[PDB]
Amino acid sequence: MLDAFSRVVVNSDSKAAYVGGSDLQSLKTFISDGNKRLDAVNCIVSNASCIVSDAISGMICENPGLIAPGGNCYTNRRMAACLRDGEIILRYVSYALLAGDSSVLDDRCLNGLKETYIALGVPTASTSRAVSIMKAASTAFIMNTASGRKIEIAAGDCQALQSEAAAYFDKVGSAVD
Amino acid sequence: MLDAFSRVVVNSDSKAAYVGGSDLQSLKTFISDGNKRLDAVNCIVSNASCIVSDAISGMICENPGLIAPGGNCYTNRRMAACLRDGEIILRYVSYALLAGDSSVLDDRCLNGLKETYIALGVPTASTSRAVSIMKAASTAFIMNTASGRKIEIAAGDCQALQSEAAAYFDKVGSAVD
Amino acid sequence: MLDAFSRVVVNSDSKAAYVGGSDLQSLKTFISDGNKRLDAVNCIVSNASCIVSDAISGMICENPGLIAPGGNCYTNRRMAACLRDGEIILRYVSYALLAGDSSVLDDRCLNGLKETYIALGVPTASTSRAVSIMKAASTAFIMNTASGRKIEIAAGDCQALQSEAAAYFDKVGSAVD
Amino acid sequence: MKSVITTTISAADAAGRFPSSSDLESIQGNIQRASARLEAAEKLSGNHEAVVKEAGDACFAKYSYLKNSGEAGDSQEKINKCYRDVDHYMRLINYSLVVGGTGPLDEWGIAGSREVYRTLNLPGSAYIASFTFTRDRLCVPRDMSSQAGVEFVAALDYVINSLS
Amino acid sequence: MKSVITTTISAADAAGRFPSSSDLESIQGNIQRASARLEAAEKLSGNHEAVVKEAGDACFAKYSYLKNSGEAGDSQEKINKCYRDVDHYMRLINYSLVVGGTGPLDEWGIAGSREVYRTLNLPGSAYIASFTFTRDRLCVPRDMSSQAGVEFVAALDYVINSLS
Amino acid sequence: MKSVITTTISAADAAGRFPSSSDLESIQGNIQRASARLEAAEKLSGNHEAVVKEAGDACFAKYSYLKNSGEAGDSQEKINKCYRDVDHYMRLINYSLVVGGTGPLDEWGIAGSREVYRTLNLPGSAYIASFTFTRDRLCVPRDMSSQAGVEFVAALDYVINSLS
Amino acid sequence: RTVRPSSKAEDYMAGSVRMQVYQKGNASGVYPVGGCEDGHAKGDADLRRVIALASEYRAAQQGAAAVTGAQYASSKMAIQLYGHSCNHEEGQFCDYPAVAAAMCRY
Amino acid sequence: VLRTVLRSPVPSGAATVYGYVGRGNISVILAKADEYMAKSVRKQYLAKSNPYGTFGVQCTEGSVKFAADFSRIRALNAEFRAKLGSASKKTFDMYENRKNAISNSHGCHHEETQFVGYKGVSSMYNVSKSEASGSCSRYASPETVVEAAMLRFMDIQVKMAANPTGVYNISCNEGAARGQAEDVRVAALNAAFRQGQKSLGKLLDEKYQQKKQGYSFAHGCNYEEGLINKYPALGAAFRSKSYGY
Ligand SMILES: *[C@@H](C)C1=C(C)C(=O)N[C@H]1Cc1[nH]c(/C=C2\N=C(C[C@H]3NC(=O)C(CC)=C3C)C(C)=C2CCC(=O)O)c(CCC(=O)O)c1C
Ligand SMILES: *[C@H](C)[C@H]1/C(=C/C2=NC(=C\c3[nH]c(C[C@H]4NC(=O)C(C=C)=C4C)c(C)c3CCC(=O)O)/C(CCC(=O)O)=C2C)NC(=O)[C@@H]1C
Ligand SMILES: C=CC1=C(C)[C@@H](Cc2[nH]c(/C=C3N=C(/C=C4\NC(=O)[C@H](C)[C@H]4CC)C(C)=C\3CCC(=O)O)c(CCC(=O)O)c2C)NC1=O
Ligand SMILES: C=CC1=C(C)[C@@H](Cc2[nH]c(/C=C3N=C(/C=C4\NC(=O)[C@H](C)[C@H]4CC)C(C)=C\3CCC(=O)O)c(CCC(=O)O)c2C)NC1=O
Ligand SMILES: C=CC1=C(C)[C@@H](Cc2[nH]c(/C=C3N=C(/C=C4\NC(=O)[C@H](C)[C@H]4CC)C(C)=C\3CCC(=O)O)c(CCC(=O)O)c2C)NC1=O
Ligand SMILES: C=CC1=C(C)[C@@H](Cc2[nH]c(/C=C3N=C(/C=C4\NC(=O)[C@H](C)[C@H]4CC)C(C)=C\3CCC(=O)O)c(CCC(=O)O)c2C)NC1=O
Ligand SMILES: C=CC1=C(C)[C@@H](Cc2[nH]c(/C=C3N=C(/C=C4\NC(=O)[C@H](C)[C@H]4CC)C(C)=C\3CCC(=O)O)c(CCC(=O)O)c2C)NC1=O
Ligand SMILES: C=CC1=C(C)[C@@H](Cc2[nH]c(/C=C3N=C(/C=C4\NC(=O)[C@H](C)[C@H]4CC)C(C)=C\3CCC(=O)O)c(CCC(=O)O)c2C)NC1=O
Ligand SMILES: C=CC1=C(C)[C@@H](Cc2[nH]c(/C=C3N=C(/C=C4\NC(=O)[C@H](C)[C@H]4CC)C(C)=C\3CCC(=O)O)c(CCC(=O)O)c2C)NC1=O
Ligand SMILES: C=CC1=C(C)[C@@H](Cc2[nH]c(/C=C3N=C(/C=C4\NC(=O)[C@H](C)[C@H]4CC)C(C)=C\3CCC(=O)O)c(CCC(=O)O)c2C)NC1=O
Ligand SMILES: CCC1=C(C)/C(=C\C2=NC(=C\c3[nH]c(CC4NC(=O)C(C)=C4CC)c(C)c3CCC(=O)O)/C(CCC(=O)O)=C2C)NC1=O
Ligand SMILES: CCC1=C(C)/C(=C\C2=NC(=C\c3[nH]c(C[C@H]4NC(=O)C(C)=C4CC)c(C)c3CCC(=O)O)/C(CCC(=O)O)=C2C)NC1=O
Ligand SMILES: CCC1=C(C)[C@@H](CC2=N/C(=C\c3[nH]c(C[C@@H]4NC(=O)C(C)=C4CC)c(C)c3CCC(=O)O)C(CCC(=O)O)=C2C)NC1=O
Ligand SMILES: CCC1=C(C)[C@@H](CC2=N/C(=C\c3[nH]c(C[C@@H]4NC(=O)C(C)=C4CC)c(C)c3CCC(=O)O)C(CCC(=O)O)=C2C)NC1=O
């Protein structure tokens, strides 16, 4: 776990000098951005449960072999483990949104999950499909273009931050496969 | 690779004595059986490809998540590797039928199959389902009770031998899981 | 574990209604105060180790029976335990300064301390003397009337808050006895 | 209780440290967000009655089968209970709103609510109909300030996302 | 590293919760206190050389016996070490000043410095003479803004109060 | 081990085919020749003791210089070793006779025997005197059936023609 | 702490089990008096880190006999306490013993 | 969220693909046994290439005054390319190396058990057998126009058997950096001329031996074995599929 700040500081420590203005200017873009990231995290963390439910239900909708006997979603046990895994994924993504760096996501969740799912026989393609659906649903919430729930926000441009969030979900989906 | 003969001889070598009438008596049951095993092997080896086709087709039929995109049967290449794997499984099973002992099946096919399928992400429960369908189809041909093809044979009792072949399929299905 | 806010809320919950404007008005006095509490806690927490050294040294100075053999400060080990206990007391006092309520002080430090010192034979009057000296030293820092170190602060009155901190140290000194 | 101050205090107590500038900074955020939330708390203490009345009335407007004589809410005392239950919820939204964070709303209302509501045959979708009715009847400028309203939104959504 | 957002995310991660409004108010305080201490960070990266020079020169101005031939700093290379060591310290004050909190300054400089300095016969009172010299030479209005200055004071005091 | 069914299954495995009618005819010849050499196996398990005893006794009846004080067979323990070695040989003839082929007799007895016998000063002509003594004492009708006897002859000759 | 897993999979599984135990203990965000508590007085946390890593090294150096006995023991014991004729968890205890050792939870 | 703070275990894909991981912490032991055991096979066959004690013509390794070190750099990079494989390539290599080790075992039960038991050990057996015997593609020498021609044709059909796709895989990889190619070209030419300078009976038993590898790869075809009786370099041209190339 390293935020934006600690990332700049560690890079300056490897460079072995003081941080300087340049890095401080990019940091002023982060802090000067601020409550766009705050309102964004408020949006994803608001509609969290519902994102996870819709995404995994859609994932079972694309291929009904999971809920077919012998599939990895065939029981209540397996379905519950499925739902909590999608929830934990969304959780760490939101952590990485407030953090501004993916250090927490890389260390605490990503590092050793692929081998683990392979050892347990979780199908990875299905997981990346679910990560993709959570990606689209979460970017649609974060841009407030969700067609069901559309709340009042102070207007402006926050596409760059949506690009950041898309990058973290692409990191997870690239990692699980 | 050890047949029933080599198994009796290895057991007598671990016992560190001569052969003896008991082990020779079980060997006289083997030799006295003989052409029941010959005709059995002729039956399964005759209808082998058709067994593989039916069993894999049924396996895709129980859960269509395989053929769903993201499933391990969604392509012609993955399906071809599927068909040749079922075929080679049945090939080593027929080897274990001529042999009378599962040594060839344990060494040449079983030793590192689970790890292979885990490394490739092959769903193990679907493989055990395919081995189960090949079990029932192979016992149905071996008893000549198949409802499509029923060829003329010299009459008798071959239940023991069916029990042996069922034991081999249960060994494979227990191994893949 | 309850701050100002949680104390208002718990009192309204025993009253079994909503919070209202009166309790919120007292809370607006708290929030409207704000950075005086911040600067206060910054002052005590800045010179904290120095305060513990001076207070415990003064405590040994008034009655040299503690450093006399048979006294509880007679050894390096027991002097060390004495100094860390003065430090921990000051730690929880600072926590009660940020909290605004003595809930953290009552639960996390005060709960079982008199019995513990009775069980160890620590003299309680000596402890109340050390808490008194930490009181005087800490109020002198918090008013910035310290005889050695006098740092720049935006001008104003912080006497209320010093009365709060004096209340906490009198709570600790009354508790240890 | 889960709050910014408690977290800063808890973190420092678990670490064994004096409170450095990080908790002070965290506290600064508390004293800066405070006014927006407390205004919303004032207005919630203003009109909670009409909030509960429209909430429960729209709740049975959606789900009529509850006043049928199977399902639970089929007597005047239990409609008083349903109305009463909501009033607890709005009062907890006022409590958590004044506190800052989800502390009292979690530890009084949410923790172990699953066993109780699953035991006493109580559907969550009725509650969610109530909360979402209030959230759709909400407003941008006319009753409240917009920014504080966002805080209110968050808390109400948390209740929904803690319930199902 | 100890900081605002790492404390809050760490606490939410240990608890297994989503980041609620409490962490949002914490990072609110972070993004509001930011500009001040980053200004102080800019000026520290400005004139660190004269800071180290006056620090070490006043350090040996107080303690002359170090350049005597017992005590360690009695060669030009070891006075370069003393000066070099201070430079580390000011750079970690810059790092922790940028981060917010005492994270990098604690985990790089303070943690286990007791065994090193107590092992290598290094007196802490020399360091403290240097830092208190810089803290007394600091300023209210003339070089910096007062508010940011307070942040700098905090970090420097922490170093002193983490030493002895 | 080298045998009929292992040669055919090994060939089908190296070829990657199902076992066709050719392997079926091979194991047909195995199950037709089987009863004869298993009868010879029964009689070998019958009287192996006097086979080893007359084998070794005639072996030292031919070669007396082994019990001379130079060579290995000059002590009672090593004559026990010589008899014991011959017992292992007759047991390997029984094993390979049961199997069918020369598999266990090759891989247990013949493989690496040259380095051991050449190393430990062991003459092969003594073994060949023993085996040829048993082969000359064999019989046509009295103990065995003639055809199975031929199988025994084959195995014993193989030993001699694998030895020198 | 004594048991060391023999795979990347048992690292992540074992880690996850431990996390889930401590999260089952304490739902609320505030830390609870007692518990882990590395810090009592300043300078404690670093010694905690050092004693922890040293005990990890001695946990690493152990013999074959000790390791195998610890794995059987941890599998059985954690089954007897936390696996109630439930083939999933009985399987994932007998499969990976370090997860079971995380399941001891005492 | 990893359980072990210090020296957390990281078994290699090869270690995991195999059954080496175990309860006893064998993975250290089995992995080590394989490495030591594998060298043993290589040193045995290197003992068979030079009975007399002086290094043969085969082991020359370099004519230019610094080309030996170049071969050392190239050998380690080739092992690194062997390590960068995917899952399916690893299981494909372990099964085909397994079956080829068993077909070269000539029915010895003991050896077959130790090839299934130690998959890593078998692969170096295949390679080192084919290098010691002399029945390998590098040691092919055409002796008519038609041998040279059919090694071109046969070679091309083998490379089409290995890469059906247009993408060149990891297995080919002539160079690592700049200037690698010309040096590999130099040493590759020096190998062929070096083969020209062998002794006589070595070349004769190499011919017979390449025919023997031709019979096995050919398996049951009168046609193919007829051609191997016509031209013996084709048996050297039967690479295994566990090479790419
Ligand atoms: C107990 C299981 C804990 C839970 C639950 C939790 O969320 N975190 C645990 C308690 C906790 N620990 C700290 C602070 C530190 N802990 C340290 C020890 C580790 N650091 C190491 O390098 C090693 C060896 C590899 C260990 C064992 C150290 C050091 C610190 C920081 C010390 C300092 O001076 O600040 C904290 C506070 C930080 C946080 O997580 O918010 C907590 C709650
Ligand atoms: C209204 C939308 C429901 C329903 C409500 C009923 N609730 C009943 C019982 C009950 N409700 C709660 C939750 C409540 N108590 C609290 O202390 C708090 C928060 C602090 C809440 C939110 C509890 C704990 C209980 C049990 C104790 C009690 O009886 O009060 C209830 C009685 C059920 C029965 O006895 O059968 C009803 C009817 N009524 C409905 O029609 C809808 C579904
Ligand atoms: C503690 C909680 C907390 C929040 C939830 C935020 C909420 C918030 N957002 C903004 C402010 C803003 N918020 C956004 C965000 C948006 N951009 C869009 O395209 C979308 C509609 C939306 C993201 C989904 C933008 C663009 C601004 C700046 C608006 C402007 O200046 O025009 C402001 C005014 C101050 C500022 O400029 O930062 C506030 C209070 N702040 C807080 O303190
Ligand atoms: C090389 C090829 C080859 C064959 C094709 C078989 C053919 C064959 N089978 C039998 C003989 C036999 N074959 C069988 C087989 C069975 N009978 C049943 O009723 C079952 C359905 C079926 C097993 C699945 C049986 C039971 C006999 C003995 C009695 C009989 O004639 O049915 C015989 C007579 C000799 C004997 O008793 O063994 C022959 C030549 N043998 C060979 O060597
Ligand atoms: C996170 C770290 C942090 C700090 C270090 C403080 C720093 C700080 N203090 C004040 C502001 C203040 N700070 C104090 C404090 C006091 N003045 C006195 O004369 C007393 C001696 C002393 C209490 C012991 C006072 C009284 C003010 C308001 C007026 C002033 O500037 O003095 C302000 C301006 C905003 C305000 O009015 O609150 C700031 C930024 N705030 C923070 O958030
Ligand atoms: C990055 C942060 C940073 C700082 C905070 C300053 C700190 C600082 N101040 C001085 C130096 C100085 N600072 C002061 C200031 C003072 N005059 C007084 O009457 C008051 C006591 C006090 C203001 C409140 C003076 C007078 C000097 C010159 C001292 C001298 O030459 O005698 C020096 C030595 C170099 C110089 O001469 O400029 C340094 C490093 N410099 C930095 O680079
Ligand atoms: C990241 C932060 C960081 C630091 C703060 C330093 C701290 C530090 N100083 C020394 C080492 C040293 N530090 C000093 C300094 C001193 N000379 C004196 O006369 C004074 C008492 C004092 C300056 C005020 C000296 C002289 C040595 C060498 C000591 C010796 O070898 O005898 C060492 C041992 C390694 C070395 O020899 O360099 C370390 C870790 N190093 C770091 O990595
Ligand atoms: C599985 C089959 C099998 C065998 C056939 C034997 C073969 C065999 N014999 C010996 C070893 C021996 N064998 C003999 C036998 C001889 N004494 C003589 O006078 C005669 C020449 C000859 C009997 C005809 C002797 C004397 C030794 C010991 C030699 C010595 O130590 O000098 C050894 C070395 C190990 C040992 O000392 O026992 C072996 C492998 N062992 C086996 O495991
Ligand atoms: C990496 C491997 C790994 C496992 C094997 C599990 C093992 C496991 N199960 C539970 C927890 C649980 N496990 C079960 C399961 C059971 N329900 C029953 O009726 C049966 C007896 C049994 C299924 C056969 C239940 C019900 C709980 C929750 C128990 C409770 O909260 O009361 C917990 C505590 C955390 C939690 O609540 O999830 C853990 C660590 N977790 C892991 O990380
Ligand atoms: C220049 C000389 C020259 C040759 C001699 C051949 C030799 C040869 N045959 C095959 C390939 C093949 N060769 C055969 C032939 C056989 N089918 C059987 O039933 C019998 C055992 C055998 C005939 C007697 C088959 C079936 C294949 C394809 C094998 C497969 O894909 O499974 C391949 C691999 C490329 C391919 O698929 O075509 C090559 C190099 N090619 C050459 O370029
Ligand atoms: C013809 C047998 C054969 C060989 C030699 C083969 C692979 C192969 N071994 C090769 C090399 C190679 N292999 C060896 C080992 C070797 N040579 C011998 O004469 C003996 C008895 C050896 C050990 C069994 C050497 C000395 C070399 C030359 C030095 C070097 O290049 O490292 C090459 C060339 C490029 C490369 O390094 O990959 C190749 C392509 N594949 C085969 O079928
Ligand atoms: C009879 C009990 C017993 C004990 C306590 C023992 C060894 C032992 N474990 C010890 C420590 C120790 N052991 C544990 C073990 C532990 N952790 C767990 O999660 C569980 C379930 C544990 C029980 C095995 C902890 C938490 C600690 C405290 C942390 C620490 O102090 O490092 C100690 C104290 C000194 C040390 O750190 O080594 C000792 C002496 N050997 C024993 O047989
Ligand atoms: C029949 C099996 C099945 C499903 C289940 C859905 C699942 C689903 N939701 C999507 C995507 C999706 N889902 C939601 C969330 C959702 N919409 C809302 O307005 C509210 C309130 C929601 C929670 C209740 C949003 C907001 C989107 C983005 C598209 C949009 O603007 O609505 C997408 C598009 C994925 C992509 O873009 O790659 C899919 C596949 N689709 C199926 O075929
Ligand atoms: C002989 C044994 C002995 C001691 C040791 C001292 C210890 C001591 N310091 C005090 C109190 C005290 N101490 C300091 C801190 C101190 N002063 C400074 O200006 C600087 C820079 C300091 C650290 C170096 C301050 C600031 C006060 C408050 C009084 C004041 O304004 O100086 C008090 C008064 C306590 C009270 O008010 O109840 C005592 C007893 N007294 C003794 O009899």
DSSP calls for chain D: ---HHHHHHHHHHHHT----HHHHHHHHHHHHHHHHHHHHHHHHHHSHHHHHHHHHHHHHHH--GGGSSSSS--SHHHHHHHHHHHHHHHHHHHHHHHHSSSHHIIIIIITTHHHHHHHTT--HHHHHHHHHHHHHS--SSSSS-HHHHHHHHHHHHHHHHHH-
Cα–Cα distances in Å, from B71 out to A56, H105, H174? 16, 39, 37
Please tell me if residue A109 touches chain H, with a CB cutoff of 8 Å.
yes
Under 8 Å between Cβ of B70 and A123: yes
3-class SS at A140? helix
Probe target for ligand 3 pocket from E24, E25, E33, with the most ligand atoms within 8 Å of CB? E24
Write the DSSP string, E93-132: HHHHHHHSSSHHIIIIIITTHHHHHHHTT--HHHHHHHHH
> Cβ(G55) to ligand 9 under 6 A?
no
Q: Cβ of C145 under 8 Å from any chain D Cβ?
A: no
Question: What are residue E89's phi and psi, to 5 degrees?
Answer: -65, -40
Give Cβ neighbours of residue A44 (< 8 Å, ≥ 6 apart).
A51, A90, A93, A94, A97, A138, A141, A142, A165
Question: Measured between alpha carbons, how far is A41 from A43 in angstroms, rounded to an integer?
Answer: 5
* Separation CA C103–CA C8 (nearest Å): 13
CA nearest B62: which of E156, D29, A74, E47? A74
| Residue carrying the six token digits 């300064």 | C97
- The CA distance from H141 to C105, in Å, is 91
CB B20 within 8 A of CB F46: no
Q: Give me ligand 5 centre to Cα E153, in Å.
A: 14
Please choose, from the candidates D122, D149, D121, D117, the residue with its C-alpha nearest in 3D space to the C-alpha of residue D135: D149
Q: Which residue has the tokens 């392997």?
A: F23
CB atoms A6 and E104 under 8 Å: yes
- Read off the tokens for A81: 């483990």
Q: Which ligand is nearest to the CA of C58?
A: 14
Residue B37: count of CB within 10 angstroms of its CB: 22
Q: Which ligand is nearest to the CA of C153?
A: 5
Phi and psi (nearest 5°) for C71?
-70, 160
Identify any residues that bridge with C69 across adjacent strands, giving them in sequence order. Answer: C71
Whether the Cβ atoms of residue F40 and residue F46 lie closer than 8 Å to each other: no
State how far the alpha carbon of D158 is from the alpha carbons of A45, A46, A137, F159, in Å.
Answer: 9, 7, 19, 87
Interface of B with H in 114-143 (CB under 8 A): 115-116, 119-120
Q: Would you say the CB of residue H57 lies under 6 angstroms from ligand 11? A: no
How many angstroms separate the CA atoms of E14 and H3, rounded?
Answer: 15
D54/D58 Cα distance (integer angstroms): 6
Distance from C-alpha of B81 to C-alpha of B87, rounded to nearest angstrom: 10
Half-sphere exposure of C148 (CA within 13 A, CB side): 7
Q: What is the 3-state secondary structure (H, E, C) of C18-42?
A: CCHHHHHHHHHHHHHHCHHHHHHHH
Q: Give which of F130, F53, F52 is closest to F91, Cα–Cα.
A: F52
Rounded to an integer, what distance in angstroms lies between the CA atom of residue D118 and that of residue A25?
54
Return the structure tokens found at F161.
């023609």
Q: What is the largest distance, in Å, between two alpha-carbon atoms of chain A?
A: 60
Q: Answer for the pair C51, C138: CB distance below 8 angstroms, yes or no.
A: yes
DSSP string, F116-160: HHHHTT--HHHHHHHHHHHHHS--SSSSS-HHHHHHHHHHHHHHH
Half-sphere exposure of H75 (CA within 13 A, CB side): 8
CB distance E93 to E85 below 8 Å: no
Report the alpha-carbon distance of residue G35 to residue H6 in Å, rounded.
23
Rounded to whole angstroms, how far apart are CA atoms B34 and F35? Answer: 12
**Residue H165 Rama label (left phi>0; alpha psi -120 to 50; beta):** beta
Provide DSSP, F15-39.
HT----HHHHHHHHHHHHHHHHHHH
Instruction: State the DSSP string of A59-126.
Output: HHHH-TTTTSTTSTT-SHHHHHHHHHHHHHHHHHHHHHHHHSSTHHHIIIIITTHHHHHHHHT--HHH
E97 token code pair: 């000043």
Asked if D13 reaches chain C (Cβ–Cβ under 8 Å), the answer is yes
The neighbouring-strand residues paired with H128 are none
Instruction: State the angle between helix axes of B159-176 and B76-99 in degrees (0 to 180), rounded to the nearest 10.
Output: 140
- Indicate which technique resolved this structure: cryo-EM
Contacts of A115 (CB under 8 A, 6+ apart): G7, G8, G9, G12, H16
Q: How far apart are CA A8 and CA A93, in angstroms?
A: 21
Selection from D80, D95, D92, D85 nearest residue D126 by Cα: D85
SS3 C94: helix
Test site for ligand 6: of E44, E45, E47, E93, most ligand atoms within 8 A of the Cβ: E47
Q: Is residue B175 a contact partner of residue B114, using CB atoms and an 8 Å limit?
A: yes
The angle subtended at Cα H178 by Cα H175 and Cα H184, nearest 5°, is 45
Q: Would you mind telling me the total number of residues written for chain G in this entry?
A: 106
For residue C102, the tally of other CB atoms under 10 A from its CB is 20
**How many residues in total does chain F contain?**
164
CA distances H34 to C4, E106, H20, H30, H242, Å, are 68, 46, 10, 6, 19
Q: Is E25's Cβ below 8 Å from some Cβ in A?
A: no
Which amino acid is present at F87? D
Q: Which residues contact D17 (CB under 8 A, 6 or more apart)?
A: C91, G39, G42
Structure tokens at A163: 């690009």
> Rounded to 5 degrees, what are φ and ψ at C69?
-65, 130
Residue nearest to atom 10 of ligand 5 (CA): C35
- Residues C138, C166: Cα–Cα separation, whole Å: 9
Q: Give the experimental resolution in Å.
A: 3.5
Count CB atoms within 10 A of the CB of residue D116. 9
Distances (CA, A) of D88 to D51, D94, D95, H98: 12, 10, 10, 71
- Closest partner residue to E25 (CB to CB) among D2, D4, D11 is D4
To test the pocket of ligand 7, the residue of E54, E78, E107 to mutate (highest count of ligand atoms within 8 Å of its CB) is E78
Residue spans of alpha helices (H) in chain E = 4-15, 21-46, 48-62, 76-99, 103-104, 113-119, 124-136, 146-163
Give the alpha-carbon dihedral of H33, H34, H35, H39, to 10 degrees: 100
Q: Which residues of A touch E19 (CB under 8 A)?
A: 41, 45, 94-95, 98
Nearest Cα residue to H215 out of H58, H92, H106: H106
Contacts of H119 in chain B (CB under 8 A): 112
DSSP structural state of residue G31: P
Residue C71, beta-bridge partner list: C69
Q: Separation of E37 CA from ligand 6 center, angstroms?
A: 18
Among candidate residues A152, A158, A129, the one with its CA nearest the CA of residue A37: A158
Shortest distance, CA B108 to any CA of chain F (angstroms): 9
Containing H183, the helix (H) or strand (E) segment is helix H180-196
Quickly tell me which residue has 């009796």 as its tokens: B8
Q: Tell me the C-alpha to C-alpha distance, in Å, between residue C21 and each of D32, D146, H31.
A: 19, 20, 74
Q: How far apart are alpha carbons D96 and G92 in whole angstroms? A: 41
Asked if residues H20 and B111 have their Cβ atoms less than 8 Å apart, the reply is no
CB contact under 8 A, H99 and F6: no
Burial classification of residue D23, based on how many CB atoms lie within 10 Å of its CB (0-12 exposed, 13-18 middle, 19 or more buried)? buried
Cβ-based neighbour number of residue B161 at 10 Å? 19
Measure the CA–CA gap between H12 and E34, rounded to whole angstroms: 45
Pocket probe mutation, ligand 1, options E2, E9, E13, max atoms within 8 Å of Cβ: E2
CB H214 within 8 A of CB H228: yes
- Rounded to whole angstroms, the Cα distance separating C148 from F39 reads 113
CB-count burial class (<10 Å; 0-12, 13-18, 19+) for C71: middle
Nearest CA to ligand 1 atom 23: G49
Cα–Cα distance for residue pair G89/G100, rounded to 1 Å? 9
Q: Side chain identity at F45, as an amino acid letter?
A: S
Question: Rounded to whole angstroms, how far apart are CA atoms H244 and H134?
Answer: 20
- The residue whose two tokens read 């300023």 is E139
Residue H97's identity, in one-letter code, is N
Q: Helix, strand, or coil here: H12? A: coil
| Cα–Cα distance measured from residue D109 to residue D124, given in angstroms and rounded to the nearest whole number | 13
Burial class for A34, CB neighbours closer than 10 Å (0-12, 13-18, 19+): middle
Segments in chain B forming alpha helices (H): 4-14, 21-33, 35-46, 48-62, 76-99, 103-108, 113-120, 124-142, 159-176
CA-only gyration radius of chain E, Å:
18
- How many alpha carbons lie under 13 Å from residue H136 in its C-beta half-sphere? 15
Residue of chain G with shortest Cα separation from A78: G88
The 3-state DSSP class for residue C71 equals: strand
Distance CA F128, CA D160 (A): 95
**Does the beta-carbon distance from H116 to B108 stay under 8 Å?**
yes
Q: What are the structure tokens assigned to H151, written together?
A: 């090694």
C-beta atoms of B112 and H119 within 8 A: yes
DSSP-based three-state secondary structure for B30: helix
- Taking CA atoms, what residue in A is nearest to B127? A70
Interatomic CA distance for residues E47 and E28, integer angstroms: 30
Q: Tell me the C-alpha distance between A68 and A64, whole Å.
A: 6
CA–CA distance, C166 with A60 (Å, rounded to integer): 63
CA atoms within 13 A on the CB side of H221: 9
Burial of B66 (0-12, 13-18, 19+ CB in 10 A): buried
- Which stretches of F2-123 are DSSP H helices? 4-15, 21-46, 48-62, 76-99, 103-104, 113-119
**Closest ligand to the CA of A44:** 3
> For chain B, how far is it from start to end, CA to CA, in angstroms?
24
Distance H155 CA to ligand 8 centre (A): 53
Question: Is there a contact between D161 and A42 if contact means CB atoms under 8 Å apart?
Answer: no
- Are the C-beta atoms of residues A86 and A55 closer than 8 Å to each other? yes
Among G28, G31, G42, which would you mutate to test the C interface (most chain C Cβ atoms within 10 Å of its Cβ)?
G42
Atom index in ligand 14 nearest the CA of residue C141 equals 26
Q: Distance between the two ends of chain D, CA-based, in angstroms? A: 23
> D103 CB near a chain C CB, below 8 Å?
yes
Dihedral in degrees, nearest 10, Cα atoms B146, B149, B155, B159: -30
E21/D2 Cβ within 8 A: no
CB atoms within 10 A of CB D68: 10
Is residue C156 within 8 A of residue C36, CB to CB? The reply is yes
H216 Cα to chain F: minimum distance (Å): 9
